[PDB]
Design a protein around this ligand. Structure first.
Ligand SMILES: *SCCNC(=O)C(C)(C)Oc1ccc(Br)cc1
Ligand SMILES: *SCCNC(=O)C(C)(C)Oc1ccc(Br)cc1
Ligand SMILES: [Mg+2]
Ligand SMILES: [Mg+2]
Ligand SMILES: [Mg+2]
Ligand SMILES: [Mg+2]
Ligand SMILES: [Mg+2]
Ligand SMILES: [Mg+2]
Lengths: 236, 6, 236, 6
């Protein structure tokens, strides 16, 4: 890797600088280099990794959706044939997105997940694995589409099983996992009832545990609970 | 459109 | 170039798609490929080229300013030594920015300017040449800093001389050139009085020519005039 | 900060 010659601590410091400069591609490259040092990541380092790649892939997804919309409109009735360019460029963005997802999944498989023994780290990584298979599923059309969807579901389900055994219902990682798995059910698995049930049950069980929290933990938990309520409002 | 994810 | 095998028209079509998807690096690569076909650019194509590179370099400049601010604060009194990383990363962004500027200046020199005979095209390209030397000047510290500043000034001055002879005072390219040359005087050449005089004279001469314009031309001209007034308000 | 340029 081009980051192989840079100190782990310097990669982490530069990822933080890249975040302040809103240079998310750089941030992701620095965090990939840090993961490839082979040591486990701390909680803050896991956040830097996730923020970097979520922003890179989020921009790719937004661009893909714009291009896919144009492509679908170009393929309707009465639409003037514009040639292969819209499809080619949507495919170009799609292949770039798939490459980023494969990179993240590769870091998780080699070897972040297998060394993650505490619930905070293991649930976070398994959630990321579900997330990046979900982004692959958003663009998938081939023989492997169902397997991609099932890979997302399986990673989310393992994360859920650990989170319910090992974390309180207000833990922000448990809440964020449930938020994203609920979105998976709604958008990917064509299971809106499962999406709604999961979001509502997660919200209600968190509400009943807020009394145990400090003011700062309360702020963290209620922030994610509001996202669950926002999605429930969109869907009901 | 994007429902919320984190 | 990696765009050598793609049709000119397909590069233009893809630049437009990239703009709709806010993929400005792609947009710039497509427009670089289109310029390298060797044919002159139309007015719309010149706009696609300028928009693509202005957005790429604009993001680099914003990131450079964040990093330079952090670097300066790190070098003050009582600041804890953080190592070489802030300087290294500011240098990395700086070198990338310089590379984009060199790429644009290379397209202008090989061979956009020498084939541009009409005022609309030649003034626009000479303005871009002043702009990209100005961005180089913003980061320059070496033996060549004064020559970089003079290269910006010389390109802007040639563009000004043509624009005053060949374009009406409300022409949006003439106005945009004056806006940017005025910023050059204020920020680069340490000449705030020249900056203010140029902006005011340009505004006043445009105001006196608005009566000649259609409603659509009036909208275009007054948009740039408002930017001149905005800068004058900042500076006085 | 950026004064306006086009
Ligand atoms: S990990 C990045 C820092 N956290 C966040 O940005 C927010 C959204 C505030 O909190 C969470 C992020 C991810 C997860 Br799994 C839970 C909370
Ligand atoms: S060339 C891109 C289209 N034009 C614009 O975005 C605005 C700012 C509206 O107009 C101008 C841009 C550049 C110049 Br030199 C003049 C006007
Ligand atoms: Mg070391
Ligand atoms: Mg494909
Ligand atoms: Mg259940
Ligand atoms: Mg051809
Ligand atoms: Mg340098
Ligand atoms: Mg004068």
């Amino acid at each position: 890797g081009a980051m192989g010659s840079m100190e782990r601590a310097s990669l982490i410091q530069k990822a933080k600088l890249a975040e302040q400069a809103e240079r998310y591609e750089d941030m992701a490259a620095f965090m990939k280099g840090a993961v490839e040092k082979g040591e486990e990541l701390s909680n803050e380092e896991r956040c830097l990794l996730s923020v970097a790649y979520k922003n890179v892939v989020g921009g790719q997804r937004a661009a893909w959706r714009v291009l896919s919309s144009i492509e679908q409109k170009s393929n309707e009735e009465g639409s003037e044939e514009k040639g292969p360019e819209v499809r080619e460029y949507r495919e170009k963005v799609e292949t770039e997105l798939q490459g980023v997802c494969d990179t993240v999944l590769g870091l998780l498989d080699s070897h972040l997940i297998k060394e993650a023994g505490d619930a905070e780290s293991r649930v976070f990584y398994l959630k990321m694995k579900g997330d990046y298979y979900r982004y692959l599923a958003e663009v998938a059309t081939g023989d492997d589409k169902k397997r991609i969807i099932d890979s997302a579901r399986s990673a989310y389900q393992e994360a859920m099983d650990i989170s319910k055994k090992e974390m309180p219902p207000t833990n922000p990682i448990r809440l964020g996992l449930a938020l994203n798995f609920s979105v998976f059910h709604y958008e990917i698995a064509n299971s809106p009832e499962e999406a709604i049930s999961l979001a509502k049950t997660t919200f209600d069980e968190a509400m009943a545990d807020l009394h145990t929290l400090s003011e700062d933990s309360y702020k963290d938990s209620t922030l994610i609970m509001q996202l669950l309520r926002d999605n429930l409002t969109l869907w009901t | 459109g994007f429902p919320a994810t984190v």
